[PDB]
């Protein structure tokens, strides 16, 4: 009866001390409380410590195992135990594994999990060099121990887990004896759809589970009955915030049909909690699905609650506040959370503020402790399920309920076990949850990862616990005498985003798109920005003479501008960008064709260049270097601007290549004049004004206009002292030509140009990473960066899934108007390149298997298009749109893959993509591409962080954004004074 | 550019020699930013995040 | 200093970011007379420690030390594959020079030459 | 050929030998311990002994 809560949106990232003030002095228990607990939590951990057979800890702890090592002995493990004949798994154990063919063995072992006929006699030769993650181990622990360790990994893959190549198989493995219950709830192991197809299979196997987990329920009323895990993002391909119109549209009756067919069987069906970006999207989700008057009469509907995340109780609130509107009993999971790291990474990457979660583990834990109080008061309408196998939490839960009934405790299958039967035995009314991990072969590691970086954590309690150096009353101590101070709330050693580089520099501001009110402000802001789009008259050739002859006059104050000086100018440039980012980011997708996380992101690098240019500049320029010599003498080497500069910048990325180009310049003591890509001077003419509102003499910069032949006319100028160019391969050509023919001084040419940019994917890739970073790195901004994919390689093994996936993630990208925020490819920037690209498609149809040809809009829009090659030699340009072309090999061809590689004679970026750290560093011996990335996409380039510009027919350097690029524009002068005179 | 002394023999380290306009490129042989030249960059970057 | 190690750059946890410098290919290194020792070996050995193979050229009018420069580097642990001396007047200059397959190139001597030099690398592909 | 010998005595005389026994094998430095220690990789416990030392006048023990 009472009103549904508005949508959630609580903020993001509050700060810690403030929370910590009420949080401290609210846990706060009696001496005879404490007392309880503490005896409590000791026979806990007395019984956890009698040691039964073990735990994944206990295995990475017994062979000191790193996660990947543990991960691949797990992968290797479950195909072993896939194997028909035992015998067959105990004669390549002892005969086989360890003694050699060490990659073979770890690539046929994932691979396997895509690919189950990948996996099936070889002869190996002796004396093999011991690489990959194997091979490694072997050389380390030796073969034996090696094969004692998969042994053991063996009967946890198969104690702990319930798996099959398909649900079907998994479900009819994890079966009890007859007309019994299942003593297990089920921890599907599905997440992350990235295909049309892949939620549709996810929800069959979710529908599949709840029929087999029905039939055997047993004849108890809840909680006494079973219960099923389900995530959002396995039942939606692009489970996002700025995908939410069709995410409502779409997932709320995927969701509701489920759940309906758990309240047929009267069951517990709990929606997982995922990463904080995602938390207000799901409980929109939720909330909606909650909804529907066909889930009255049954009180198994629930979800669980990420205590390590700032807005946790608010959560509790909003749920409640459901609960009661709707008349509803939920049963609601209290977790500390599984994705801090994620956490922490994405914040940073994203400038954020703030983290949403804490960033001590003392307040964590606190803040699960207060939400576990919020919680047992809100029974009976609300019964609370504390998912942890923390004994202190658990013993600490347990005083506070001052009873037994209403509540559960959690935890998964081979974790918390003596833990939980000492708690049963101790107290009869205690009930806990035990879920086991079931699902499929093909979504096993990326369960297994996530699963890993928790049991491998220092600070895990289940690790420390199991390390007998820890005394058990170490694990005793309360948070709050951890913390002990609201100000020591956050970690000592965590910057926020905001400081990723201090000292150096301040970074760029971002935007959570996962934060409605950031989200919906950013767009409300840039939809402010009014542009009509008014013609810029171009310059005539005398025009363009006249801008040198006045950059040249301009040169020599400029130059003689202390360093200091000029670096303050390009800092208030940094300034003025992000105050007037709206302003900017609508440019960017008005004239540029944008979506708003690239224009975003475009601005955040203009800024970040003025900050690290300015700080570089200080640090060359600031002062001389004293060189060492005789005494009697003085010698100090400087650096002087070499005089005018002509900067000629793309259309793809307007504003950050151009300001990057141009504050380079200035900095090292050059005056400029710039030449903006023909369809984008309005944006150059805006960053223009602002670098001289910001402190840039207008008689040190100049903006000319016009196209090729302008650009020409300030190159062939006899007056210019170096030229910084960004484009194509052919044009810097043709102006290092232009350069050469001259009489006078040879002038520095920096020209970053163009790639025929390929990823490499072994078969210990994750598929579904591979195809998130292909997706984003081939057809991210229309596939309009030179960083770009253009040419996948995949083994054999795995290119069906990996090709599969990658285009069914492509079908999913919206492609449209740049100013919608759901859109995710824009237009291509002119009638030209849609004509260009339109021409190399119609001709890779004749001659190439088309995998994908997506749906484009009327105008000048290209969809993602995925063509695969007989082999890499087929692709001999660089095709500037959306438009991925694969190859696959055979293992034992690499150096064929590389000699592919090498034979375009580009170098720009290089993707890798595996698990085999001997893979990644022979590739990276071998090539010779100015950025390779590993396990990630290939896009994106941080100034200061990853100097991006590549060699051969993709550069000359020195790279963008990197410590090498201002000497470049200014010249060295050595000045020797004998000073014998003065004694 | 030398002052109250010969105008040469200069010395590896401590006079970094070679001009510029008609007279040079640079960089100056001799001195710390001449070796840069005659390499290429190559930036590394590795998602860490699976181990921890 | 330069190559004995990579630089580390600041980033978000969970990545590591390196740069590193490496050797371009093969530099063509041509010496004049005046210096024709000191010159000619301050050229190779740069280019050599930068980790690129060289194809040195010297002054027709100073073969000689040039030849007993290479021979001392070679004995003083440059590989033979990593170093060759190729001798002769300006046409083989040029030859060097306009090879498709040089990744630079480090010249002392007139001006005049240098922008032959520099237009023959210009005009390549 | 190898020889297996066996403590054998009195209850009486075993602490002064017990005491001898675990000193030794309680010793970081000891071979049996750290081969029994996961973490020290195989090739570590191969180190030559001359390698460690490297010259004369580092024989004695710094500290
Ligand atoms: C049955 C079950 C279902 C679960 N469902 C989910 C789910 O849907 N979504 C989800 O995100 N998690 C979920 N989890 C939680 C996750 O998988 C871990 O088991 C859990 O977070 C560990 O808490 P603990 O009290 O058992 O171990 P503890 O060792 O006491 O605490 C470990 C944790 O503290 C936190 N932490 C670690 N370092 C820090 C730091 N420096 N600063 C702040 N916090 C830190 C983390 O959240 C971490 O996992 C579930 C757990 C179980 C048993
Ligand atoms: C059957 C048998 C009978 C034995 N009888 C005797 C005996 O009669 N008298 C006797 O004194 N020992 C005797 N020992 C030796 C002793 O009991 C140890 O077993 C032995 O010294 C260990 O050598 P190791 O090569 O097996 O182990 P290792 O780990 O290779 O070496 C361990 C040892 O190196 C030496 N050491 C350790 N640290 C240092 C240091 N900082 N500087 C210099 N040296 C160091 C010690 O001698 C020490 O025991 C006997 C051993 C056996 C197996
Ligand atoms: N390596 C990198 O960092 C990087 C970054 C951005 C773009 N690019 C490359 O740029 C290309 C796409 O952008 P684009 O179409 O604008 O490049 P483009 O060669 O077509 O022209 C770019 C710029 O040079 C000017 N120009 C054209 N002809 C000229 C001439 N004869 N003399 C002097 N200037 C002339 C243009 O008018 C313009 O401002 C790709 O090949 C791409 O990979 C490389
Ligand atoms: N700035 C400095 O550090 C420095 C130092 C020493 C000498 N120099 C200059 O060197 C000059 C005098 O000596 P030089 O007579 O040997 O110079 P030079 O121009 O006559 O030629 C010198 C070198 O280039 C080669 N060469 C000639 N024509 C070539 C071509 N067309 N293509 C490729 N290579 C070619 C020669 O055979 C020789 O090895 C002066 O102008 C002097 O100042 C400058």
Same mark, same amino acid.
């Given at each position: ?765 994750? =598929?579904?990473? !591979? +195809?998130?970073? %292909? ?6 901004? $229309?596939? #309009? &960066?030179?960083? @770009? ?28 108007? =740049?100013?919608? !925020? +759901?859109?995710? %490819? ?6 030209? $390149?849609? #004509? &260009?690209?339109? @021409? ?144």
């Amino acid at each position: 009866m009472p009103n549904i809560p508005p949508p959630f949106t609580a903020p993001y990232a509050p700060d810690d001390a403030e929370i910590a003030a009420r949080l401290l002095p609210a846990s706060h228990l009696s001496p005879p409380q404490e007392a309880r607990i503490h005896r409590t939590a000791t026979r806990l951990i007395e019984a956890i410590r009698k040691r039964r057979l073990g735990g994944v800890e206990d295995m990475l702890r017994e062979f000191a195992l790193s996660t990947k090592e543990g991960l691949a002995l797990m992968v290797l493990a479950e195909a072993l135990l896939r194997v028909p004949d035992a015998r067959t798994a105990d004669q390549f154990i002892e005969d086989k594994l360890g003694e050699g063919d060490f990659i073979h063995h770890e690539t046929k072992s994932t691979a396997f999990l895509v690919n189950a006929s990948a996996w099936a006699a070889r002869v190996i030769q002796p004396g093999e060099t011991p690489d990959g993650t194997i091979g490694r181990l072997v050389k380390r622990l030796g073969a034996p121990a090696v094969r004692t360790a998969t042994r053991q990994a063996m009967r946890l893959m198969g104690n702990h887990f319930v798996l099959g190549e398909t649900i079907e198989q998994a479900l009819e493995r994890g079966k009890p004896r007859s007309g019994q219950k299942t003593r297990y709830s089920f921890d599907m192991l599905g997440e992350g759809a990235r295909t049309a197809a892949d939620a549709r299979r996810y929800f069959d196997a979710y529908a599949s589970a709840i029929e087999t987990i029905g039939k055997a329920a047993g004849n108890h009323a809840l909680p006494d009955r079973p219960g099923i895990s389900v995530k959002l993002s396995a039942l939606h391909p692009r489970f996002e915030a700025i995908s939410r119109a069709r995410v409502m549209v779409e997932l709320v009756p995927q969701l509701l049909d489920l759940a309906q067919r758990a309240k047929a069987h009267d069951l517990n069906f709990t929606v997982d909690a995922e990463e904080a970006d995602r938390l207000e999207l799901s409980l929109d989700v939720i909330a909606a699905t909650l909804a529907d008057p066909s889930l009255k009469g049954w009180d198994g509907f629930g979800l669980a609650i990420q205590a390590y995340q700032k807005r946790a109780s608010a959560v509790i609130d909003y749920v409640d506040a459901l609960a009661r509107a709707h008349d509803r009993k939920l049963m609601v999971r209290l977790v500390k959370g599984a994705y801090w790291d994620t956490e922490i990474k994405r914040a940073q990457e994203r400038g954020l503020d703030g983290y949403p979660v804490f960033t001590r583990k003392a307040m964590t834990d606190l803040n699960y402790v207060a939400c576990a109080s919020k919680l047992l008061a809100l029974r009976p309408r609300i019964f609370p399920q504390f998912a942890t196998h923390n004994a202190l939490t658990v013993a600490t839960v347990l005083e506070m309920a001052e009873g037994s009934s209403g509540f559960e405790f959690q935890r998964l299958h081979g974790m918390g076990e003596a833990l939980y039967e000492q708690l049963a035995k101790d107290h009869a009314d205690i009930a806990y949850r035990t879920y086991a991990p079931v699902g499929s072969h093909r979504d096993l590691l990326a369960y297994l990862v996530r699963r890993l970086l928790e049991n491998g954590a220092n600070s895990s309690f289940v690790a420390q616990a199991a390390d007998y150096r820890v005394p058990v009353p170490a694990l005793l101590q309360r948070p709050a005498d951890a913390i002990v101070r609201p100000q020591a709330a956050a970690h000592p050693r965590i910057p926020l985003p905001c400081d990723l580089f201090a000292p150096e520099r301040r970074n760029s501001r971002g935007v959570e798109f996962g934060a409605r009110t950031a989200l919906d402000q950013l767009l409300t802001d840039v939809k402010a920005e009014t542009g009509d789009l008014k013609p810029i008259a171009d310059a005539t050739p005398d025009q363009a003479h006249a801008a040198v002859a006045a950059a040249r006059a301009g040169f020599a104050g400029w130059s003689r501008t202390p360093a200091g000086i000029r670096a303050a100018a390009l800092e208030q440039a940094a300034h003025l960008l992000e105050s007037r980012s709206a302003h900017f980011i609508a440019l960017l997708q008005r004239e540029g064709g944008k979506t708003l996380d690239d224009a975003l992101s475009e601005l955040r690098e203009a800024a970040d260049f003025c900050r690290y240019y300015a700080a570089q500049g200080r640090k060359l320029f600031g002062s001389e270097t004293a060189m060492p010599g005789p005494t009697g003498e003085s010698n100090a080497l400087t650096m002087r601007g070499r005089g005018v500069f002509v900067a000629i910048s793309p259309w793809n990325f307007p504003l950050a290549i151009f300001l990057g180009q141009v504050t380079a310049a200035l900095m090292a003591g050059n005056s400029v004049v710039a030449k903006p890509a023909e369809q984008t001077p309005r944006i150059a003419r805006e960053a223009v004004a602002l670098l001289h509102e910001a402190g840039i003499p207008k008689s040190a910069l100049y903006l000319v206009t016009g196209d090729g032949r302008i650009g020409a006319a300030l190159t062939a100028h006899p007056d210019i002292a170096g030229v910084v160019f960004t484009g194509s391969t052919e044009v810097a050509r043709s102006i290092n030509r232009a350069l050469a023919a001259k009489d006078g001084p040879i002038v520095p040419l920096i020209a970053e140009t163009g790639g025929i940019n390929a990823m490499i994917a072994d078969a210990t890739a994750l =598929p579904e990473q !591979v +195809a998130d970073d %292909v997706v984003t790195s081939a057809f991210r901004s $229309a596939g #309009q &960066r030179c960083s @770009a994919l253009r040419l996948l390689f995949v083994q054999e093994d795995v290119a069906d899934r990996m090709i599969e996936m990658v285009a069914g993630a492509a079908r999913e990208l919206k492609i449209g108007d =740049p100013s919608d !925020v +759901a859109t995710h %490819v824009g237009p291509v920037i002119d009638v030209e $390149a849609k #004509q &260009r690209l339109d @021409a190399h498609i119609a001709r890779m149809k004749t001659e190439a298997r088309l995998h994908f040809a997506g749906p484009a809009p009327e105008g000048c829009f290209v969809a993602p298009h995925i063509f695969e090659l007989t082999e890499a030699g087929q692709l001999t340009e660089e095709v500037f749109g959306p438009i991925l072309h694969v190859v696959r090999y055979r293992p034992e061809n690499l150096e064929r893959v590389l000699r592919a590689i090498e034979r375009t004679g580009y170098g720009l970026t290089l993707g890798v993509h595996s698990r085999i750290d001997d893979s990644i560093e022979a590739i990276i011996d071998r090539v010779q591409v100015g950025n390779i990335y590993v396990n990630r996409n290939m896009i994106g380039a941080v100034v200061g962080v990853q100097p991006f510009g590549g060699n051969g027919l993709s550069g000359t350097g020195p790279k963008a954004g990197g410590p090498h690029y201002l000497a470049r524009f200014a010249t060295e002068q050595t000045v020797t004074i004998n000073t014998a005179a003065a004694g």
